[PDB]
Amino acid sequence: SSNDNIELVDFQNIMFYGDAEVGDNQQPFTFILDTGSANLWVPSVKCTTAGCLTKHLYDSSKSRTYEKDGTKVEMNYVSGTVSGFFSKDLVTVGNLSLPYKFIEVIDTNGFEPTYTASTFDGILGLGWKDLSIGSVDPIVVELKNQNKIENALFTFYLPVHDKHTGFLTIGGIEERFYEGPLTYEKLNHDLYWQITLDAHVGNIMLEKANCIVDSGTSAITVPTDFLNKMLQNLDVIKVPFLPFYVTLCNNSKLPTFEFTSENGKYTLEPEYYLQHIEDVGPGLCMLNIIGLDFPVPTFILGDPFMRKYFTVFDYDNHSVGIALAKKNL
Numbered sequence: 001s002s003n004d005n006i007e008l009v010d011f012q013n014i015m016f017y018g019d020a021e022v023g024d025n026q027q028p029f030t031f032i033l034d035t036g037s038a039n040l041w042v043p044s045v046k047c048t049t050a051g052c053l054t055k056h057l058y059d060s061s062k063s064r065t066y067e068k069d070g071t072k073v074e075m076n077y078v079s080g081t082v083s084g085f086f087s088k089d090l091v092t093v094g095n096l097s098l099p100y101k102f103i104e105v106i107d108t109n110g111f112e113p114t115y116t117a118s119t120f121d122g123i124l125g126l127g128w129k130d131l132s133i134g135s136v137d138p139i140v141v142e143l144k145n146q147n148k149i150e151n152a153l154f155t156f157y158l159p160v161h162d163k164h165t166g167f168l169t170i171g172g173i174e175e176r177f178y179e180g181p182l183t184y185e186k187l188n189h190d191l192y193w194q195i196t197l198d199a200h201v202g203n204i205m206l207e208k209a210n211c212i213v214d215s216g217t218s219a220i221t222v223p224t225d226f227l228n229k230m231l232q233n234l235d236v237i238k239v240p241f242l243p244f245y246v247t248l249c250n251n252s253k254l255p256t257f258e259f260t261s262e263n264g265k266y267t268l269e270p271e272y273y274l275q276h277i278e279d280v281g282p283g284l285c286m287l288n289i290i291g292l293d294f295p296v297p298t299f300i301l302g303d304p305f306m307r308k309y310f311t312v313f314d315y316d317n318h319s320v321g322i323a324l325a326k327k328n329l
């Protein structure tokens, strides 16, 4: 194991967290390793908002490495907003450290109910410098320059609650994680880890859709129209005015997603995008699929996808490698 690993843990059998510390002294926090954002923030010991009570807070004054900044920042997410200011200090991910620029959050009110209801402290962006606010170079990129890692690539082997933990491998591809050949898809832009694939479900086809590989999205995002046409003769129930879709987990009409490029095709069948809703009702399932439209027809291949496919994120080669993850390490 010549490359920097980071154990991931199952969170409510849907999301997952990993740990990393700030300051020359440990000061550990629990993060959501989000390839869908390019900023690293953390709850400041100075936070006054209620959502911070349950969290681990950052004490800049107890770190010889701290380096004041103060320019205020506002991290905007589809799910919430966070306030604070920039500060700099030694960020330790796995067994590697580097003076990094991050946000010391002090107001978390615009990130509820999520934040208070969740176990993570902050979010660690794994996207591209252009997705970042305050133009910060990706962490993995810095590490490469500083010859801390061979190549600027990070790997994701999502965990499974009781089967195995997961891993965020840095600077190296380990076959332990996947079986079969890796297939690379070049990024259509250096923003999100976005590639171009053809989105085919049943009789429905969306050519060259923009597919975003996001470890920070617990669901599978699909453009609204595509989703509607998709659920037509399916016997799925969308509770009125709610993004809540219920089915018999056994519903034999449920389709398998099919994303194809010239190098390969990736499918995501029912067993992967269905969430059990037993307590609601016996043999009942929800879709864990969301209707979401972007300026350009986009699919967010979130956790559900990554849980099935081991993924490689290459900065140096600007592409994403995909391969079937081992059913078990």
Ligand SMILES: CCOC(=O)C[C@H](O)[C@H](CC(C)C)NC(=O)[C@@H](NC(=O)[C@@H](NC(=O)CC(C)C)C(C)C)C(C)C
Pocket (backbone or CB within 6 Å): 032, 034, 035, 036, 037, 038, 076, 077, 078, 079, 080, 114, 123, 131, 214, 215, 216, 217, 218, 219, 288, 289, 290
């Ligand atoms: C630079 C901004 O980056 C982004 O806007 C996307 C981030 O990756 C962000 C993660 C940060 C918010 C951490 N993702 C989301 O906001 C997504 N939210 C979720 O996946 C949440 N899941 C649900 O609410 C469940 C439904 C989808 C069923 C999850 C955070 C709990 C949305 C795009 C869907």
